[PDB]
Amino acid sequence: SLALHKVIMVGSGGVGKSALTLQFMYDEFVEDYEPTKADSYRKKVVLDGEEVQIDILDTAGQEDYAAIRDNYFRSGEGFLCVFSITEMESFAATADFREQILRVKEDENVPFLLVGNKSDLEDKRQVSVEEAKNRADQWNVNYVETSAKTRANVDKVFFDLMREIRAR
Ligand SMILES: Nc1nc2c(ncn2[C@@H]2O[C@H](COP(=O)(O)OP(=O)(O)O)[C@@H](O)[C@H]2O)c(=O)[nH]1
Numbered sequence: 001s002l003a004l005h006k007v008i009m010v011g012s013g014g015v016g017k018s019a020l021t022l023q024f025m026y027d028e029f030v031e032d033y034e035p036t037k038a039d040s041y042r043k044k045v046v047l048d049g050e051e052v053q054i055d056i057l058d059t060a061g062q063e064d065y066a067a068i069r070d071n072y073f074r075s076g077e078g079f080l081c082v083f084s085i086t087e088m089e090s091f092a093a094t095a096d097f098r099e100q101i102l103r104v105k106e107d108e109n110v111p112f113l114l115v116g117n118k119s120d121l122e123d124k125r126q127v128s129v130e131e132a133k134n135r136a137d138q139w140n141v142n143y144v145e146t147s148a149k150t151r152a153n154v155d156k157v158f159f160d161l162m163r164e165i166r167a168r
């Protein structure tokens with residue numbers, strides 16, 4: 001039987017959670033994907049020679065019922081905490097999600113990657129690579145910049161996260 005890995009996408013609105021999920025899943029950039037939809041996706045992928053299945057839960061703010069949210073988080077094995085390099089407030093918001101995840105999983109070593117998305121909009125960058133890295137260092141997690149549009153580092157973030165999961 002193939003090993004199953006559960007990944008959870010978290011972050012504020014419009015940072016690219018759905019766009020990253022769909023690029024990785026179906027290899028296509030889907031613009032204006034319905035913002036209030038939360039859904040799960042699964043498929044087989046090859047990680048370092050081994051065939052495994054990845055399950056991705058794409059969350060949305062609309063679903064704010066505590067019991068439901070906490071259940072989704074407790075079921076996740078790794079998290080991609082996404083923000084938009086073009087929105088300073090989304091970067092600041094990452095602290096909020098980090099707090100909720102730590103509250104529910106009580107594990108400061110839980111597989112977690114800080115993801116700065118929309119790297120293709122460099123000319124609108126409001127968050128420098130320096131400040132993002134400093135924060136990542138403080139939480140002892142790695143930082144990766146992606147673009148759901150050009151697909152830069154998209155496979156890398158999911159793959160790197162699965163590797164951390166594989167080691168815990
Ligand atoms: N240029 C650019 N736009 C992006 C990127 N990722 C998402 N977007 C756009 O940002 C908007 C919000 O994306 P969405 O995936 O719905 O964000 P979510 O609310 O986090 O699920 C959509 O209009 C996307 O087409 C990216 O990497 N580059």
Ligand SMILES: [Mg+2]
Nearest residue numbers: 017018034035
């Ligand atoms: Mg979405």
